[PDB]
Amino acid sequence: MIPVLTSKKASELPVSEVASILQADLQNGLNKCEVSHRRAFHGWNEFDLWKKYISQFKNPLIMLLLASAVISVLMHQFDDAVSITVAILIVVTVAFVQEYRSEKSVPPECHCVREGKLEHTLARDLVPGDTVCLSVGDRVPADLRLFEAVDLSIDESSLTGETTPCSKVTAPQPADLASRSNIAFMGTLVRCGKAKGVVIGTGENSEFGEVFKMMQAEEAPKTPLQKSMDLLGKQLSFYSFGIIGIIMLVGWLLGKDILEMFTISVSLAVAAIPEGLPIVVTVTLALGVMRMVKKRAIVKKLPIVETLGCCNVICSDKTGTLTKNEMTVTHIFTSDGLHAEVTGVGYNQFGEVIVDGDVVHGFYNPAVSRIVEAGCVCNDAVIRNNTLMGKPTEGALIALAMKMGLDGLQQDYIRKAEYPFSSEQKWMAVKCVHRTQQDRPEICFMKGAYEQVIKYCTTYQSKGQTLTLTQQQRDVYQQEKARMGSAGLRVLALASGPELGQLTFLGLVGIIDPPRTGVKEAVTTLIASGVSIKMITGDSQETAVAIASRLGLYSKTSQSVSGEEIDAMDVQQLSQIVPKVAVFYRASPRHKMKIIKSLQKNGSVVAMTGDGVNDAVALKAADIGVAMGQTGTDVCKEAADMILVDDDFQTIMSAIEEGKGIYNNIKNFVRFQLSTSIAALTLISLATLMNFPNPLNAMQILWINIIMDGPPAQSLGVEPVDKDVIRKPPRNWKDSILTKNLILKILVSSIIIVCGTLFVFWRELRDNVITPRDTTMTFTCFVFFDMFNALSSRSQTKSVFEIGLCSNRMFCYAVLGSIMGQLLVIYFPPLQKVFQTESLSILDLLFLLGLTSSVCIVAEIIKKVERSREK
Ligand code: BEF
Ligand SMILES: [Mg+2]
């Protein structure tokens, strides 16, 4: 049996040994029967509801409602039983919708050596021991041990975050993911020419497979909003059970009938549970998701919308999220001395070259145009549809030529002698003849490292004429090279001439992987907002520090910690060091997970914005998983909870503001609904205690909570948010929703509603027996109390006149609909039969409005008193 070798094991053993265990053929390939057998055993080269709905019934509130329903059906109360059943079904469905995570969001074509080469093959068809070829712009299909690689470099930015392509060698290594120069791992593009290797791993055994297993092992933390709502539900369950028990035992001591106490406990348990709260919360979160979808962000779970409003730390993958991952020629330094700055980011025509504050196009400036032409002519990389097929620096030079408008200069020259780029050579030289005139002499264009180019150059150009090189000019060029190096740029020396050793030094170009457009401004805004932004990447110290300094995360006195130090550091000292530092470099996926888990240990709500495979574990471990919509890999977008469609960081600020507004609205309607529930519970308890018959039954309580107080609460959940709410710093997730002031307001509203409703109920009670007039008076009084409480519950600080009655059109429509429904209940004969109510005179309605305005008046009085006291 032919086992799969671990990448480290394959790198350690020589080529012959690897082929011996893998039982491979270096030249001929694999027999069809052997491929079929290994595919049958190992499998293809790929990797990857009812119980969720049932689990909602485990909630204690749902259990209490089921107990109420079964007690109701034991007696002959069919209406209460069916109403409570419908309420339970609706609550369970909306809870399942809230907890449901959406998963709605060609195989790599690899030419392996199957039978005499030239086999088109597919990514899936590979089996261990297969020999697969590689070329430029070809993604690596599976982890292959490179047994033949001539001038090979591979871009592992997605896999490991290393910007520079990794040079690949065939000889076994004496001994890290990057240190294994022999192996070429799955999912990494090949920049350089050619390679061939034996497929050591297929499926779960690839590096993608190891990171996927790490991701699956991890469990995503629960959102702060979900924790707060679970705590609130536990508090409500304890309160309801305690109140029901105390009332039951007290009344039994008083001597009330057992059947009467059961038929009253049904109403008590229905009232004490706010049924509309989960529905309203789910609807609010769904509207937030829709708004984010409008704002170029796809949220995969409803509670995630509020989560970015509570985040304290935002982490970031440097390569591909903060930086475009596309090299750009930022700076040009002419040999004469002219300084030019180049805008634009990536491989595209957008942007322009600015010289001394003046935009230069075409051949306006002969020196910079000549430098651009020299860079563009001696290139192999070609850009199609803003995608690069070739070296990154050559693509950057092509993009610069595109910006200058000289992209049609590669066609004017045809190569005669080409000198390939080599690791020891460090310079590329090409001779061309101008197409229009063959009589023109041979002209050689060369580029590469400054040292070699200036060694092969003996003259330099200035003001349209050639001058002999001197020591002073070489010193100036060296100083400019040092200045560019200190700024994080990569320096290439461009030169042209008639033959090697007689070139005219043209200038220098500074190439850097630049931050994405608008990332700097968004980072500054987020830092000013109170969020501490950290950078976690697997790249080198120099590149990470340069990018961090450009974005502003890094200062002279700031500190940076490698991944190896993190591994060596103990849990405690890691917990003290991680908050201090802001840049982490050479961080493996396990190290990124360690960093985020140590941040979460201190209590911070961590959000990471990565795009690579190495960020999948970190994204799942993070409280918010943000991924780039376009550049993000399949695994990273699988581990994310929100994806930025346009790869814009302003979407992060929009999400933060939306989360803050959603939480504020949630607080408002939670206050309203708990006030209503406590008022109903207290009214029923007081009526039962003093021998009054129960004023409200299960059907009426459910009607009030859902039909009448539903639309007003789903209008309070969409109330426009004040600027001061979203301008506040991120809150502490340990804080509860029910503040002391909120509880005070809820108790005041409950007391007033109880007093008014009990007064009406007792006044209309003729001979301690409920008459339909009493039923309709109590029902309408409670509904009007609820409408006025909803009106006064729009904001905790701003008075309604300050806000405006007609500011929220949805609220006005919901209130009008509720009033029309109540009028139908008290006037429509079928509804009168259903609810055992009666028609009411206009004077009674006026009296009810006057009595029910007291809760609003007291609420605004308390608001004014609080405002005066705050000053
Ligand atoms: F892509 Be990141 F730099 F890990
Ligand atoms: Mg990345």
From Swiss-Prot:
EC number(s) for this protein?
Answer: 7.2.2.10
Q: Which reaction does it catalyse?
A: Ca(2+)(in) + ATP + H2O = Ca(2+)(out) + ADP + phosphate + H(+); Mn(2+)(in) + ATP + H2O = Mn(2+)(out) + ADP + phosphate + H(+)
Residues annotated for Mg(2+) binding in this entry: 611, 615
Where does the chain cross the membrane?
49-69, 83-101, 230-249, 262-279, 667-686, 697-717, 738-760, 776-795, 809-827, 843-863
Q: How does it sit in the membrane?
A: Multi-pass membrane protein
Record annotation: effect of changing residue 23 to C = Decreases calcium-dependent autophosphorylation
Superkingdom classification of source: Eukaryota
Expression sites (tissue/organ): Found in most tissues except colon, thymus, spleen and leukocytes. Expressed in keratinocytes (at protein level).
Family annotation (Pfam families): Cation_ATPase, Cation_ATPase_C, Cation_ATPase_N, E1-E2_ATPase
The molecular function GO annotations come to: ATP binding; ATP hydrolysis activity; calcium ion binding; manganese ion binding; metal ion binding; P-type calcium transporter activity; P-type manganese transporter activity
Instruction: Give me the Cytoplasmic side stretches, as residue ranges.
Output: 1-48, 102-229, 280-666, 718-737, 796-808
Q: Where in the cell is it found?
A: Golgi apparatus, trans-Golgi network membrane; Golgi apparatus, Golgi stack membrane
Its keywords, alphabetically, are: ATP-binding, Calcium, Calcium transport, Disease variant, Golgi apparatus, Ion transport, Magnesium, Membrane, Metal-binding, Nucleotide-binding, Translocase, Transmembrane, Transmembrane helix, Transport
> Which disease relates to this protein according to its record?
Hailey-Hailey disease: An autosomal dominant cutaneous disorder characterized by erythema, skin blisters and erosions, and suprabasal acantholysis. Blisters and erosions most often affect the neck, armpits, skin folds, groin and genitals.
> PANTHER family, alphabetically?
CALCIUM-TRANSPORTING ATPASE
Subunit details: Monomer. Homodimer.
Described by its record, this protein's role is as follows: ATP-driven pump that supplies the Golgi apparatus with Ca(2+) and Mn(2+) ions, both essential cofactors for processing and trafficking of newly synthesized proteins in the secretory pathway. Within a catalytic cycle, acquires Ca(2+) or Mn(2+) ions on the cytoplasmic side of the membrane and delivers them to the lumenal side. The transfer of ions across the membrane is coupled to ATP hydrolysis and is associated with a transient phosphorylation that shifts the pump conformation from inward-facing to outward-facing state.
Q: What is this protein called?
A: Calcium-transporting ATPase type 2C member 1
